[PDB]
Amino acid sequence: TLLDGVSLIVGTIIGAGIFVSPKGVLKNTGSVGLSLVIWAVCGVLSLFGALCYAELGTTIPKSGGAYLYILETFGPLPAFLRGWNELLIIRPASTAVISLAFGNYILEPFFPTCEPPELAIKLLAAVGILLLTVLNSLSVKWSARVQDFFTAAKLLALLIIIVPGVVQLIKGQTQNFKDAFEGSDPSIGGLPLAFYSGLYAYVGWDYLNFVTEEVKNPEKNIPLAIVISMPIVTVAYVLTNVAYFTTLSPEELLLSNAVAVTFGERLLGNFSWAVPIFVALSCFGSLNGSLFAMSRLFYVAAREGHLPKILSMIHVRRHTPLPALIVSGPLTAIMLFLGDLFSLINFMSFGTWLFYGLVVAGLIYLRYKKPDLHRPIKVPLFIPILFLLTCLFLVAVSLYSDPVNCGIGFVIILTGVPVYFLFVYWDKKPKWFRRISEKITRHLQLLLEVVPEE
Amino acid sequence: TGLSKEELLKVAGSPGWVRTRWALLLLFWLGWLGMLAGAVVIIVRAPRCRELPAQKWWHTGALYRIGDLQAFQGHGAGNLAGLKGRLDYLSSLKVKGLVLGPIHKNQKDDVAQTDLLQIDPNFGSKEDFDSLLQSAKKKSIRVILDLTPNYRGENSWFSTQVDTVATKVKDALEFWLQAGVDGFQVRDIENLKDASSFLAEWQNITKGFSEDRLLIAGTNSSDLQQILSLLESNKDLLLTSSYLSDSGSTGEHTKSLVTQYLNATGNRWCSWSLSQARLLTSFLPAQLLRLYQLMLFTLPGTPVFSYGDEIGLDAAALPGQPMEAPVMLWDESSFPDIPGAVSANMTVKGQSEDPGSLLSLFRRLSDQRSKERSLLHGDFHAFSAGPGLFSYIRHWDQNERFLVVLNFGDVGLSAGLQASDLPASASLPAKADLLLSTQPGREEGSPLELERLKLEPHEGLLLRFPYAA
């Protein structure tokens, strides 16, 4: 089921910043062909990451350890350095950016003369998130069907941009906009968020690699699925860019808005129907995905024994991990409050580069000392090494680019560590604390209507 | 313990938490709904950005006039291939289009022989011009044909009967439609049997052909009110006029001249040219010329020049060619009539090298207008300023603000900017991002403090601001 695995990662993960990253690489570069190639490079890096994740899966299949395997190589403490921090950082930042992108899309058809100010973009986005946690709290299988509805519309959301782009391609707009170009930069300029941003659009696959390891197929063939799927993504990126340079002009892409709407404005007839809520539906699918990712990981932390089981668990009425969803609410709300999409991206930028850096660092180390990683595909350490090298250099430059949010993000990452000590390795938890924690959680469960993580 | 036992919770399971939770739930989605309502009313209460008021061809970009093919090409051959090469030059200029000179069989003061339709073969065949027009379209160039039926002769309107050719105009509208020409330049009106009716007529005929096809109402008259009456009959055309040459070399006068133009124009389609169709480079010298280039371009309207204007082609000052039959010395190489007495600064090549040249000044200027939606369309508010200081607050027809400050003549003037004459909609920031300036040493790109702005000899200042309204 390798091609199944491919659809499970390309029909799922993709376009988180598809209407963000255009200007996210254009305003961050100047070429502009090389900024499209950024999207290509982003894909290449995700290839490398995924291949490394596959190697890790075969190296240590043990616990299921989507990253717990690197803990098995680095120890337990790094869990919060890694996972908890992703929960702090990436999950809700991406949730926020996506839902804010949603809000942006939603404003603009009713404001189609200029990019609208902070309005429903944040308020509605929050409302939407809360709605989605309600939908998720409704017996998960329903939210899954709702996500299926998202997902089909999502894989129309791509097409409502790309296919019109193809029409323009057929017209020959590529030649009309052939003045976009590529070159070379001896000084090696650019800006890391741009370099992030394609990866931002397609990230999460990273862990779905372990899902494909788990999925009924030879583990030796999941690299093949990986190799197949990555160029599909870069093709989609190119096709997306085609639409952006054959329907839209380079200048229109600099209008700082949900270019889906601007794109729609360039289409004939009732273009609101040409570029409909599929964008919103796309967002919602990915938003629920991140909400479930968070709630799932909250469950996992409880299973690790680091987190109180009350923050999962049903909620018999629906049989869903509402407490976990409840935690994810505020977690995303504050990221929505932050708003600024690229600073939200800065936080994600570190997190990814550094965390995936840990994955490949482990495999590099192990190959040098304590090898037998059980490579499912005949690839060298230059896959994890070159990946690592891009990613850390991007860390350094991005730090320089925005040492405020970059500094903060890094600090948050560091403060995964002492938190781990609070959750595990703490000096002494008070008895009365335990007593009231039981009393309080009892009351909370009495409110909830419940079955605890068994 | 961080969790209570299920069976313990079933001991237990009182309404005090069960119904309470239900109440809390009601409150939960109630609050959610309140938030939802907030999200709705905040966009209901939110204003909407100005719905971007814009015309095509009118009040936009720029156009340049072609008469003789040889002249235009700095030729020589005077062929259509040379013109086609110059179409790429045009695109480097970022000009919207051009006015094809009187290609049709113009006569030596003969209204009967004149073909406004049929092409004079001593420019080429229709098919040659069709491929020309096609390549122009491929290069995003709009072409307008100057229908002066007696171009070959003395009086462009024969100094006699014009109804014969009036019919031929109509017929030519179709002949040249078939060729592919979206408009026709019209000259001196003073010699026409109520051209205002003819232009209303023909323009509407051309309107039938396309919204679109634009005739150009040029005149050698300076009577703004006659010009107005021409506009009363026909708003729809592009105007050029000696009225605008009334500017002379006086700055505040010209400022009011502009105001007057706009007053008569009202809210009609705007256009700018100091002359009907004369090299403005032959009319006035670099000092003021380069300032007028910028100025006119930066006035509400479609600025229209003649070819040679962007190269500083003062044919009146160039042995080998008269103002009346100039040669566009755009090349090194294009000087047979004045061999070696003209530098590369006349040519586009040395002018490309020279960032302050009319060529490069214009190119930069047009580069900016292609992006500046406000330069394209907005209210260039009459900002008053000291003697020789032109100034305007460009109110983008949405939300972005610009300031024109033009130091007319070679005088070391101070800012001299009356900020106090502005309405709230004009209000204006002090950080004048310098877009363009005609004495190139000035910090282009810098947020020039207006209240500490020093002006220099022949110094235009196209400035950029956020929309402090």
Author numbering:
A (entry chain B): 45 to 498
B (entry chain A): 163 to 631
Reported in the publication:
Among them, the heteromeric amino acid transporters (HATs) are unique members composed of two subunits, the light chain (SLC7) and the heavy chain (SLC3), linked by a conserved disulfide bridge.
The consensus mutated construct exhibited increased stability as compared to the wild‐type, and enabled the cryoelectron microscopy (cryo‐EM) map to be obtained at 6.2 Å resolution by single‐particle analysis. TM1 and TM6 are apart from the substrate translocation pathway and create the cytoplasmic open cavity, similar to those in LAT1 structures, indicating that our structure captures an inward‐open state of xCTcons. The ten TMs represent the common architecture of the APC superfamily consisting of three subdomains, hash, bundle, and arms. The cryo‐EM densities of the hash domain, characterized by the four helices arranged as a ‘hash’ character, are clearly resolved [Figure 5(a)]. The indistinct electron density suggests the structural flexibility of this domain. Notably, the current cryo‐EM density clearly showed the existence of a C‐terminal helix running parallel to the membrane, which was not visible in our previous structure of LAT1‐CD98hc, but detected in another study [Figure 3(a), 3(b)]. Although wild‐type xCT shows Na+‐independent glutamate transport activity, xCTcons has lost this activity.
